[PDB]
Amino acid sequence: DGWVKVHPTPGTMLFREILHGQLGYTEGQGVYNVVRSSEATTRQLQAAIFHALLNATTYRDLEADWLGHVAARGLQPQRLVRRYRNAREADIAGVAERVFDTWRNTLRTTLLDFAHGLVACFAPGGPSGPSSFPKYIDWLTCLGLVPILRKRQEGGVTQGLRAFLKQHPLTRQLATVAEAAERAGPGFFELALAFDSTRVADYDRVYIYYNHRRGDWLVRDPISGQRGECLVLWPPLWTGDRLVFDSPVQRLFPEIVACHSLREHAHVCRLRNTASVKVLLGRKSDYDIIDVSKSMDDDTYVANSFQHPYIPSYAQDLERLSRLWEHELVRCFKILCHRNNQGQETSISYSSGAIAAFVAPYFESVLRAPRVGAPITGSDVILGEEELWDAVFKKTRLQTYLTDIAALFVADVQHA
Amino acid sequence: DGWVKVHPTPGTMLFREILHGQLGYTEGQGVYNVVRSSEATTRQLQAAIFHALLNATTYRDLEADWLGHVAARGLQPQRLVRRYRNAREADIAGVAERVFDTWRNTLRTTLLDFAHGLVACFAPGGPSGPSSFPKYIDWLTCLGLVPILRKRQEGGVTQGLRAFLKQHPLTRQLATVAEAAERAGPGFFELALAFDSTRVADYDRVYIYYNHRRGDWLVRDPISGQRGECLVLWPPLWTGDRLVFDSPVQRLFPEIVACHSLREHAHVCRLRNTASVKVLLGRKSDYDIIDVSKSMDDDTYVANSFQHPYIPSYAQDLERLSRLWEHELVRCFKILCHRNNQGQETSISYSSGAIAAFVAPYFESVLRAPRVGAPITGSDVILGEEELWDAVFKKTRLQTYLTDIAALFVADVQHA
């Protein structure tokens, strides 16, 4: 009644089998390994966790902890000045600055350790299990559709967060850390539930239906009988008894088929020229391969015969396909290629817009995550975890408070 | 009832035999030797041990040890100033700074020696024996599955740790070293147990079963009858009476087979042209190789004959295959190639993302290790043991305490 099959047709399995390399392989197709990398999503998760944890800092409690540390050390400005009994301002100012610097560095490394501990719970479950990123990317590359299945339930990520947070000694050790953790807690649990709930379907099991007259999708899972919802990013085109997607493989499909047919024909022609000598026969009027035209003759004669051993060549077509594959995959997914002074492709990573165009829709619709803050740039992908934490730490709120307290302490260390 | 053989099929053994150069060898395939190196895991172990050992340092106890050293030397500020009896601040400050510098240098040397001694117990057992890394890498390269066998037991690593730790003179000599070792001890034992328990199955023994309907794995060891736990990073595809993996060898498989067949056909054609002259015979109407076609002639005649000694060429295919192998292995495993001003491939090592994508899951799942701290950078793989220890020593907790003590001593050496 207007419905039609979409995904499980063989003309769609052919696309995936092409993607696995069942129709030849090229150097250009090897760029696709970078496109599937889960580095961008892990960097985004690390940045989001760091922002959420460091945003809950407060000046009052951190100053209280600093005053408690000063009281523990017994190095108040009154006692220090009454002990030193000298007017050398530079020396005592440097002493106070170093005393503050030690505490600042220890607090920074403690916060780094806690942040890495928090990050460690999410990262492994991203690329594998429920809500897998490379599966999302290959869904996009093959069809442009991403079927998604949802169930509201708890599991590994939530249990991991509950086990990690509820007995970590740093919360008891530092009031500021515990306050920030309890303030930013609910967001972490909501993000964990978002990670757990969704699950992108598998390419060999799911069923997808399309009804042109209204333009809605019905996607079902035949094993469990579970109804899902279909996400569309680059909508297809319906031309009667057909349906043409606009995925990169669909655009690249005819060229590689033609090249494959050319290579097969060249192989067939190659196997023909094994024998060096050939013989031709015919009726009389009244290492070797022998041709017999004796039977078909009747009142005729062999007027003339020719030989021309053609062999098609296919190297130029393979070079063209390699370059075409590379250019298509670079321009479609916004891949930024780093280069040397003259050496080519020293490293490959996502561009600044590629993550905004691909990673952000993942977090926003595929996972339905609560928030991820301001997106990172295309240069923070290259940075390591420690470099990223240092980058976010300097520009965020906490550094301003830390530089604020030091100035006042250096000031009043000698005025009083 | 739906179960299918997966690994012991011949089409899987062919992949490993291809990996061992049974279908020809190329210069590009030689990059795979770097991919199997156990350098990254040893660097990660060294970094983890250094972080664990240095993070347990306590300011109070090392200050007490320094005060004990000062008491032993009899070089307290009171005695030193009362002996020198001069107002030359620069000389006395330099003397005190050198006195502290000798102690800090010898403490650094002692800590380095102890850290190397602790590291020496783990490193040999990594690449070989239980929990071998190159076997894991070639498991990933062949199929993408990593069957793993587990059994909780005590073994050589734990006995080595027990023999090394319980009678080391450094613990009795220094209170700081003993306290840090006692505090960090349980983690070392847990890591040793993690190293002992796991064992990656051998490629020529294990059995792997896959049931598409439900999608779970049953992996068994036929010799001991021990059931294992299967891991998957790059899930395969099921296309009816098949199973298509997405390992690099699977993607590269058709091309190398075509090249091998071309080379074999070229050899066969080459062996044919060894005779310079050829003779063709036929019935009369009413160093040499001679062809007899007179038997099949019957009321016929030889109308025409041809010769064309074809010899296929295969050098271009070999060069293309070498380049394809190299590019595939570079892009799939995220290999960073160092280069000269113009010279190519001065040295080859893991990139910053390669260790996070491959070394980190090994520790997380294959070993089930407790913790490894912050991951290292791809630039730290190049560094040696002493360089890595010095790198982790400067930015860790102990340096702040050591610099704090020096400034306070330099100040109080003359104000009192």
From TrEMBL, chains A, B:
Keywords: Host nucleus, Viral genome packaging, Viral release from host cell, Virion. One of its GO terms (cellular component) is virion component. Pfam families: Herpes_UL6 (PF01763). Signal peptide: none annotated. GO terms for biological process: chromosome organization. HAMAP family: HSV_PORTL. This is Capsid portal protein. It comes from Human herpesvirus 1 (HHV-1).
